[PDB]
Every structure is written in structure tokens, then in C-alpha cells.
Amino acid sequence: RLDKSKVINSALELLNEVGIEGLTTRKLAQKLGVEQPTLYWHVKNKRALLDALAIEMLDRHHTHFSPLEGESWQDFLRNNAKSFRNALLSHRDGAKVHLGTRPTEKQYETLENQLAFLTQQGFSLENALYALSAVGHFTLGSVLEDQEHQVAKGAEPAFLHGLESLIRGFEVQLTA
Amino acid sequence: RLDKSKVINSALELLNEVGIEGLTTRKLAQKLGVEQPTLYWHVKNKRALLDALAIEMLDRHHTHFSPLEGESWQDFLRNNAKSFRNALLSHRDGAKVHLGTRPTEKQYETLENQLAFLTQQGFSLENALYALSAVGHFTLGSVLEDQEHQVALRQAIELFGAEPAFLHGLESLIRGFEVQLTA
RNA sequence: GCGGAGAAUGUUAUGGCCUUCGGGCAGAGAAAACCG
């Protein structure tokens, strides 16, 4: 009856219906037509479920985490953020559920590959980490306030122009 | 005895001791030695308290929201973010409590003055607004990731305060703002 | 004392509850309550 694919897939849908704060493991159990002591074998508590949702939104939509070979470091940073953005825009309050999740080991591994690639293109290791953190921080902050300001009742162009302010600022600083 | 100056100071202290998630109007009443029906007369619920706490953290520490006499538009944006950052670092989870608070009428009015300042300095109004949202978003995002990841390549993690990423990152937008406006 | 029990209702506390009337209790893996 219940597999890993089924329970989070409905959890992804109920996250849209209710929101992160209103979300409860009990409403999920009732959504699946099951008792809670049974569902505990899949999700131990609410917090673990949020981790599973965060991992699953990144796996599905953050598809440009790696540079398509034959791509500039600029275009990589661009589309990495655009894919990272679209992943947090995939579901309601997507930035919050992604927020507060300890990262996995492959995410570290992907960071070394991200770090190595920029060093290959002339970056210093110091500036490589600063650069990667800056684009990520601005993308995360942009998505958070976007989804939060969307709780009150365009912002996409503000993200684009802001991202290019980082990139073409990265360009000039690399001139060394 | 109880004035809403004291309740904000103690709520800020309870905000530091307990955190945004644990912070509740009930614990604040216990901290002040009063019943909840008494405290309701000052702050109705948690959400009103969050706005009250957020506003005064900016009032205390966001002291460089205005361009200093005889200062570059560049240095303004740097010191604008640095003050906004220090305001969000003033208390525990300061970025989270600041998040989700819709702004005052004075803040809009302050932003229009900010917009005019950079527009007057050669910015287009469209690009003027983009710059301020970007620096704010990155500063907000930078502080959130910082505050979240403190309740916890080989050379890389070794070289990690979090301020240098903010400082170096902010200069990446301004040095990008400079080139982009030279057009 | 602790077993049914990761019990139920409920969320973000102007209220809901215990009290030996001094006071005490708790938030999505609640305070309570019942039942050996």
C-alpha cells in the first residue's frame, strides 16, 4: 500500500494545501487513509518529513547544479541559481522547508566539484567559496521574502537583474 | 510598573534566551511576573510581538539607513547593508523575526528618499529599485543562512568567520553596480 | 510508581487545564482526562 514514493508525493501536495506551519503529520496520515502508528515507519516526525521534502524538491527541479560541459563559469552560476530558485518555487513555502535542513554528503561532494570547476577557470579558492556563497545567499533570500510577501494577500525581474549584478561584478574582480 | 518599553526589552531578552520558535506571549508574561490577561493589553499575540520586536531592532542598530553628508552612493549601499546586517544580528534569529513583517509608512517614505538619492546619482528608477532589493535580499539571505547554521574543501571549511563572505559578497554587487551603471 | 500509549482533542495561548487554594501545568511525537 504505502511506499516512499506515495507518501511524500501526497505530502508535497498537502504542503501546497496547508503551508509549512499548518502542516501536521496527522493530516498527512488522514490524507493517506492510514493510522498514525503505521505511518511512523516512514516518517518519524514532522521535522524528518520536512527534510525529506527538501531533499525531494532539490532532486526533482535543481537539475542545473553541474555545468554543461562547454559552458562558461558565468552561465553556470546563472543557471545554477535559476534551477536552485525554481526548486524552491516548486511548492508553497519551498524556501522555508529547504531552510533549516542539514545538507547531505553528496551536496558536499557537489560543492567540491563546484569549487574545483571555478578554480579551473581562474578563480582563487578563497574567491570561489565567496562567489558560490554570495549567489546562493542572494537566491535564498530572494525566494524567502518572495514566498513570505506572497503570504500577505514583478519579483522575478528583480532576481534576474540582481543576479547579473553579482556575475558582472564577479567578472571585473576576476580581472587579475 | 509595566510599560511597553519594558515588555519589548524583556521580549527581546526572552527572544535571545528561547528563540523565535519557542518565544511565546505566555513566557513573556511569566518573565514579567504578570498574568496573560494583563499582558494582552500591551501585545495581543505572538505576531504583533514579532513586529514590535523587529521594528526596534532596526531602530536601535540600523543607524546608517541614510547617506552621510559627503559620501559616495557606493559607500552608502555598503554601510546600508552593514547596518541592516548588524540590525539582524542584534538578537538571536534576528533575520527570522525581521522576515514576514510588512513595513511601516515611515519605511516606505524612507525608501522613496533612498530611491531619489540613487536616481539623482545617475540611476534609472528601474535599476535603482533592483539595486536596493538585491542588496537587501542578499543581506537578508546571508544573515538567515548564518543564523540557521550556528546551532550546529578540506582547506575550505577550515577558513570559516561568516562576515568575510558577506563583506566580499556585497562588494561583488557594488562592483557590479558600478560597471553596469557605466553605460 | 508506570503499563495500554508515540492515546485522544488542541496548536502559537486576552484562553484550555491541575490545585494540597499557597500556587502549579503544558504546544504537532501537548497539558488534561479515563482504564489496570
Residue numbers in the entry:
A (entry chain B): 3 to 155, 181 to 203
B (entry chain A): 3 to 154, 170 to 177, 181 to 203
Quote the paper.
Eponymous TetR is a homodimeric α-helical protein, and each monomer comprises 10 α-helices. The tertiary structure of TetR family members consists of two domains: an N-terminal nucleotide-binding domain (NBD) and a C-terminal effector-binding domain (EBD) that also contains the dimerization interface. In the absence of its natural ligand tc, TetR binds to the DNA tetO operator sequence and thereby represses downstream genes. Upon tc binding to the EBD, TetR undergoes an allosteric rearrangement that increases the separation of the NBDs, abolishes tetO operator binding and alleviates gene repression.
The apical GAAA tetraloop (nucleotides 22–25) could only be modelled in part. A crystal packing analysis suggested that no space is available for the placement of the central AA nucleotides. It is therefore possible that these nucleotides are absent in the crystal, most likely due to a random proteolytic degradation event. To further investigate this, a second TetR–aptamer complex was crystallized. The crystal structure of TetR in complex with a shortened 39-nucleotide-long TetR-binding RNA aptamer variant K2 was determined at 2.9 Å resolution. In this complex, nucleotides 2–37 could be modelled continuously, including the apical UUCG tetraloop of which the tip was missing in the previous structure. K2 shared 74% sequence identity with K1, and the overall fold of aptamer K2 was identical to that of aptamer K1. Apart from the fully formed apical tetraloop, the only two additional differences were a shortened 3 bp-long stem P1 and a likewise altered stem P2. Since all interactions between TetR and aptamer were identical in the K1 and K2 complexes and owing to the higher resolution of the TetR–RNA aptamer K1 complex, we limit ourselves to the description of the latter and refer to the K1 complex as the TetR–RNA aptamer complex from here on.
